[PDB]
């Protein structure tokens, strides 16, 4: 069946904005997962998980009689797809159970892990999501094997279809670099937003870069991919060495024995994959990665044996039974237990990427300190495990249950608690009047609030206007934010704030985070008034102001908009066309297509463009809230052509006289070109639509202002 994608493989895809509809969700429209989880008997679920660790099933027998290592790897892979560049991937949506991640080669035999958890899932039902279950099982695995975790939060609601993530352009699983769709260029530079080295891997290749078994060069890949997953050197060494304290790899025979991944398997496989023709196909004969390495002398117990082995032996290159590159300890005795036969022992072995922890000079120093101070190792691994498994959960207000750690961590982008009465409706009216009397213009107020609120992304629930981080480094210096203009607005608003707060009694005060938002609302109200409409814009107080010391400047950098079609902004020239970047931004903002459309058309006429660009400003009454963008965009009286100087800027001329009427970018004109977007533009550009336009605009403005308001959930 030939599809629209087949005919026009480069037209824009809007289906990403309409995922996760109430249509595909089996739960009712009023289901609230937080409320269900809060009633779960978490202690009961943990008991069951503890029992499961040593209840071996014959269809995938437990190594050493204990599933703990398999489960830790399942949890680490669940979390391990996370990229800081867009916040996509991670454990927070349980996406390991859907395509493509359920069939990524690095996720081989994790299908067995998840199927082992079905009886507990079934027993507790909607009160524990798959997403939370995958992480909780990893924690219980650690605890059962003697490692005290730092804590656990529930609240990851399940999702019901695949997320649309760009995992790369390669058309071959595991393709090495330099191909027609290479994710590398230059001096081993990984393309943004990717955080893994090959299609179908979590982070790096365990044999070494493109399969070359050089621990030093592997270390560079480890550092880069881990930093693109929000982890620094200390955290990276702690996580790899901590994880490889447990369990083993699987490579008992040639890989050619392993059959189709789950999404390719026959219907009789009932959702499992990688069926192996090698001997019994499981247990002692398992093939997962193709490597055959067991790290410690007690693989089912927390120990300090990883760094004792790493440093206590010299290492020789060898091959696994499947032909993969790995390392064996020179002159060692057979001290490592076999997973199934008590009469067999094995020499210590390591992966290339484990040896990175010793032969990279920066890692070596941390590794040595961990070897000499095992309590430092344990603490670091516990903290890092918590961060790994919660990094995509968003503000601490979303954390549920009795095991949430009290300690506030910097990577959580913490917001102080509010400890004073909030402003009421009369106070809001008084503050809006002050803002409008100060001389701040509609353009300035809308631009500033937009800048503050639109850093939110629903992928990891970072960003938004709570915190007033727009006043701090680095947001106050971002080019998209117009630093000089922004400074002048913030000085004015800070003076309003100070004057209001200083006149109060009874502890009442307004945050700058709330005032920025409130001021934007006043601009929208004033713009409606300019167009002859009496409109009230909803506002919810309660934001607090974070400090600079609570704002990690390096972690904030990934939130910088380098493309923001809602302000007609593009920081540089990119290979991806700007309308694709607009839809990507709309997805991160949680906007539907109708919402994106109404929002952009209104922001254009309110003066929200960076630099006051006239691109897309299709009105003679700027700063008035009208549907003029749509009416003028769709006027067949205007003909459009790309300019000679710049093919991504277009001129709109009167068709009869040739006179220049407007200019526009690709983001502006896509609304008059794409057949679905133009159908939406036509509704808002119709003669019966002015009031609809206004009311839909206020709704989506308010939505954006509230995106991070999990304190009101």
- Return the closest-CA partner of residue 585 out of 9, 11, 16: 16
Asked whether position 243 contacts ligand HEM by CB under 6 A, the answer is yes
Report cis status (omega within 30 of 0) of the bond before 491.
no
193-212: contacts with its own copies (CB under 8 A): 199
Site track for Cl ion across 113-152, x = CB under 5 A: ----------------------------------------
Query: Of 87-95, 115-123, 124-132, 672-680, which part binds Na ion (CB under 5 A)?
Result: 87-95
376-415: contacts with ligand HEM (CB under 6 A): none
Q: How many helices (H) and strands (E) does the chain have?
A: 24, 12
Residues 6+ apart with CB under 8 A from 551: 413, 467, 469, 472, 473
Asked whether position 460 contacts Na ion by CB under 5 A, the answer is yes
- Least spacing, CB of residue 304 vs Na ion, in Å: 33
Asked whether position 249 contacts ligand HEM by CB under 6 A, the answer is yes
d(CA 704, CA 5): 31
Asked whether position 8 contacts its own copies by CB under 8 A, the answer is yes
- Return the closest-CA partner of residue 566 out of 597, 588, 531: 597
Contact indicator for 389, 75 with CB cutoff of 8 Å: yes
- Least spacing, CB of residue 280 vs ligand HEM, in Å: 16
Angstrom CA distances, 452 to 436, 598, 676, stand at: 19, 19, 30
Asked whether position 267 contacts its own copies by CB under 8 A, the answer is yes
229-234 contacts, C-beta under 8 A, 24 or more apart? 229/80, 229/82, 229/83, 229/84, 229/195, 229/203, 229/391, 230/82, 230/84, 230/387, 230/391, 230/411, 230/555, 231/384, 231/387, 231/388, 233/362, 233/363, 233/366, 234/366, 234/380, 234/384
Residues 6+ apart with CB under 8 A from 404: 151, 152, 153, 396
Query: Of 39-47, 324-332, 453-461, 660-668, which part binds Na ion (CB under 5 A)?
Result: 453-461
Asked whether position 392 contacts Na ion by CB under 5 A, the answer is yes
- Least spacing, CB of residue 189 vs ligand HEM, in Å: 19
Instruction: Give me the phi and psi of 535, to 5 degrees please.
Output: -135, 140
Tally of CA atoms within 13 A in the half-sphere of 513 that contains its CB = 25
282-311: contacts with ligand HEM (CB under 6 A): 288-289, 291
**Which position among 66, 77, 88, 223 is part of the footprint of Cl ion (CB under 5 A)?**
88
- Least spacing, CB of residue 358 vs ligand HEM, in Å: 13
Distance of CA 270 to the CA centre of its chain: 30
- The residue whose two tokens read 């607090």 is 544
Site track for ligand HEM across 598-617, x = CB under 6 A: --------------------
Q: How many CB atoms lie within 10 A of CB 404?
A: 15
Query: Of 87-95, 290-298, 380-388, 700-708, which part binds Cl ion (CB under 5 A)?
Result: 87-95
Asked whether position 245 contacts Na ion by CB under 5 A, the answer is no
Asked whether position 38 contacts Cl ion by CB under 5 A, the answer is no
Among 20, 50, 77, 533, the active-site one is: 77
Asked whether position 59 contacts its own copies by CB under 8 A, the answer is yes
Query: Of 275-283, 458-466, 555-563, 622-630, which part binds Na ion (CB under 5 A)?
Result: 458-466
**Which position among 87, 151, 155, 242 is part of the footprint of ligand HEM (CB under 6 A)?**
242
Strand runs labelled E in 89-234:
184-185, 189-190
d(CA 188, CA 204): 13
- Least spacing, CB of residue 455 vs Na ion, in Å: 16
Asked if residue 244 belongs to a known ligand binding site, the reply is yes
Instruction: Give me the phi and psi of 524, to 5 degrees please.
Output: -65, -45
163-222: contacts with Cl ion (CB under 5 A): 163, 165
**Which position among 515, 680, 700, 704 is part of the footprint of its own copies (CB under 8 A)?**
680
d(CA 91, CA 130): 10
60-99: contacts with its own copies (CB under 8 A): 97-99
For residue 641, the partner it binds in Na ion, Cl ion, its own copies, none, with Cβ less than 5 to 8 A by kind, is: its own copies
Asked whether position 274 contacts ligand HEM by CB under 6 A, the answer is no
- The residue whose two tokens read 């409008």 is 436
For residue 275, the partner it binds in its own copies, Cl ion, ligand HEM, none, with Cβ less than 5 to 8 A by kind, is: none
Query: Of 81-89, 335-343, 359-367, 380-388, which part binds Cl ion (CB under 5 A)?
Result: 81-89
For its own copies, which is the closer residue by CB, 216 or 269? 269
For residue 38, the partner it binds in ligand HEM, its own copies, Na ion, none, with Cβ less than 5 to 8 A by kind, is: none
Asked whether position 281 contacts ligand HEM by CB under 6 A, the answer is no
For residue 642, the partner it binds in its own copies, Na ion, ligand HEM, none, with Cβ less than 5 to 8 A by kind, is: its own copies
For residue 392, the partner it binds in Cl ion, Na ion, ligand HEM, none, with Cβ less than 5 to 8 A by kind, is: Na ion
Distance of CA 27 to the CA centre of its chain: 24
Please, which residues bridge with residue 319 across strands?
325
- Least spacing, CB of residue 124 vs Na ion, in Å: 24
d(CA 91, CA 70): 16
- Least spacing, CB of residue 586 vs ligand HEM, in Å: 33
For its own copies, which is the closer residue by CB, 416 or 642? 642
For residue 588, the partner it binds in Na ion, ligand HEM, Cl ion, none, with Cβ less than 5 to 8 A by kind, is: none
- Least spacing, CB of residue 320 vs ligand HEM, in Å: 9
Asked whether position 57 contacts its own copies by CB under 8 A, the answer is yes
- The number of residues that bind ligand HEM (CB under 6 A) is 24
Q: How many CB atoms lie within 10 A of CB 577?
A: 14
Q: 390 catalytic, yes or no?
A: no
Query: Of 452-460, 465-473, 550-558, 610-618, which part binds Na ion (CB under 5 A)?
Result: 452-460
Task: Spell out the SS3 assignment of 42-75.
Answer: HHHHHHHHHHHHCCCCCCCCCHHHCCHHHHHHHH
342-361: contacts with ligand HEM (CB under 6 A): 353
- Least spacing, CB of residue 513 vs ligand HEM, in Å: 36
Q: How many CB atoms lie within 10 A of CB 88?
A: 26
Instruction: Return the DSSP state at 268.
Output: G
Angstrom CA distances, 313 to 294, 479, 687, stand at: 15, 52, 80
- Least spacing, CB of residue 198 vs its own copies, in Å: 13
Environment class of residue 502 by beta-carbon count within 10 Å: exposed (0-12), middle (13-18) or buried (19+)? exposed
Binding site members for heme b: 244
Catalytic annotation, residues: 77
Q: Which residues bind ligand HEM (CB under 6 A)?
A: 63, 69-70, 72-73, 76, 203-204, 206, 222, 239-240, 242-244, 246-250, 288-289, 291, 353
Q: Which residues bind Cl ion (CB under 5 A)?
A: 88, 163, 165
Q: Which residues bind Na ion (CB under 5 A)?
A: 90, 392, 459-460
């Amino acid at each position: 069946g030939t599809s629209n994608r087949d005919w026009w493989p480069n037209q824009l895809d809007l289906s990403i904005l309409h995922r996760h509809s109430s249509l595909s969700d089996p739960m009712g429209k009023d289901f609230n997962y937080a409320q269900a989880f809060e009633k779960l008997d978490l202690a009961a679920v943990k008991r069951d998980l503890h029992a499961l660790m040593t209840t071996s099933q014959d269809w995938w027998p437990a190594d050493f009689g204990h599933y703990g290592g398999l489960f830790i790897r399942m949890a680490w892979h669940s979390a391990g797809t996370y990229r800081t560049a867009d916040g996509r991937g991670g454990a927070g949506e349980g996406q390991q159970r859907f395509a493509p991640l359920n069939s990524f080669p690095d996720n081989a035999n994790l299908d067995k892990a998840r199927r082992l958890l079905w009886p507990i899932k079934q027993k507790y039902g909607r009160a524990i999501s798959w997403a939370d279950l995958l992480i909780l099982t990893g924690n219980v695995a650690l605890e059962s094997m003697g490692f005290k975790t730092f804590g656990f939060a529930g609240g990851r609601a399940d999702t019901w279809e695949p997320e649309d993530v760009y995992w790369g352009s390669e058309k071959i699983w595991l393709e090495l670099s330099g191909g027609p769709n290479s994710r590398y260029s230059g001096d081993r530079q990984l393309e943004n937003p990717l955080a893994a080295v090959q299609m179908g891997l979590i982070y790096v290749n365990p044999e070494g870069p493109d399969g070359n078994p050089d621990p030093v060069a592997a270390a560079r890949d480890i550092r880069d991919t881990f930093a693109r997953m929000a982890m620094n050197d200390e955290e990276t060494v702690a996580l790899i060495a901590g994880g490889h304290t447990f369990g083993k790899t699987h490579g008992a025979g040639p890989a050619s024995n392993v059959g189709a991944e789950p999404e390719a398997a026959g219907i009789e496989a009932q959702g499992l994959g990688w069926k192996s023709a090698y001997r019994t196909g499981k247990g002692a004969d398992a093939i997962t990665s193709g490597l055959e390495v067991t790290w410690t002398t007690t693989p089912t117990q927390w120990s300090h044996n990883f760094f004792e082995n790493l440093f206590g032996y010299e290492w020789e290159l060898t091959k696994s039974p499947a032909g993969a590159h790995q390392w064996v300890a020179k002159g060692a005795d057979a001290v490592i237990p076999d997973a199934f036969d008590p009469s067999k022992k094995h020499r210590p072995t390591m992966l290339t990427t484990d040896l990175s922890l010793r032969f990279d000079p920066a890692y070596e120093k941390i590794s040595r300190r961990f070897h000499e101070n095992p309590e430092q190792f344990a603490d670091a691994f516990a903290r890092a495990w918590f961060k790994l498994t919660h990094r995509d959960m968003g503000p601490r207000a979303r954390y549920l249950g009795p095991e949430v750690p009290a300690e506030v961590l910097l990577w959580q982008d913490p917001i102080p608690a509010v400890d004073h009465p909030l402003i009421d409706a009369a106070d809001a009216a008084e503050l809006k009047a002050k803002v409008l009397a100060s001389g701040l213009t509609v353009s300035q107020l809308v631009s500033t609030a937009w800048a503050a609120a639109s850093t939110f992304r629903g992928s990891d629930k970072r960003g938004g206007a709570n915190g007033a981080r727009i006043r701090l480094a680095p947001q106050k210096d971002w080019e998209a934010n117009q630093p000089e203009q922004l400074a002048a607005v913030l000085e004015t608003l800070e003076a309003i704030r100070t004057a209001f707060n200083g006149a109060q009694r009874g502890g009442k005060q307004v945050s700058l985070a709330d005032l920025i938002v409130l001021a934007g609302c006043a601009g929208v109200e004033q713009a409606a008034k300019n167009a002859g409409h009496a409109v009230t814009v909803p506002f919810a107080p309660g934001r607090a102001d974070a400090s600079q010391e609570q704002t990690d400047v390096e972690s904030m950098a990934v939130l910088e908009p380098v493309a923001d079609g809602f302000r007609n902004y593009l920081k540089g020239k990119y290979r991806v066309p700007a309308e694709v970047l607009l839809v990507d931004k709309a997805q991160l903002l949680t906007l539907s297509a109708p919402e994106m459309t109404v929002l952009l058309g209104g922001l254009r006429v309110l003066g929200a463009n960076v630099g006051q660009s006239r691109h897309g400003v299709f009105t003679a009454r700027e700063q008035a809230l009208t549907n003029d963008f749509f009416v003028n965009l769709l006027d067949m009286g205007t003909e459009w052509k790309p300019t000679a100087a710049d093919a991504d800027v277009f001129e709109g001329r009167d068709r009869a006289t040739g006179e220049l009427k407007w200019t526009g970018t690709r983001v502006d004109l896509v609304f008059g070109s794409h057949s679905q977007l133009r159908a939406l533009a036509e509704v808002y550009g119709s003669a019966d639509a002015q009031e609809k336009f206004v009311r839909d605009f206020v709704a989506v403005w308010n939505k954006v202002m509230n995106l991070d308001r999990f304190d009101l959930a």
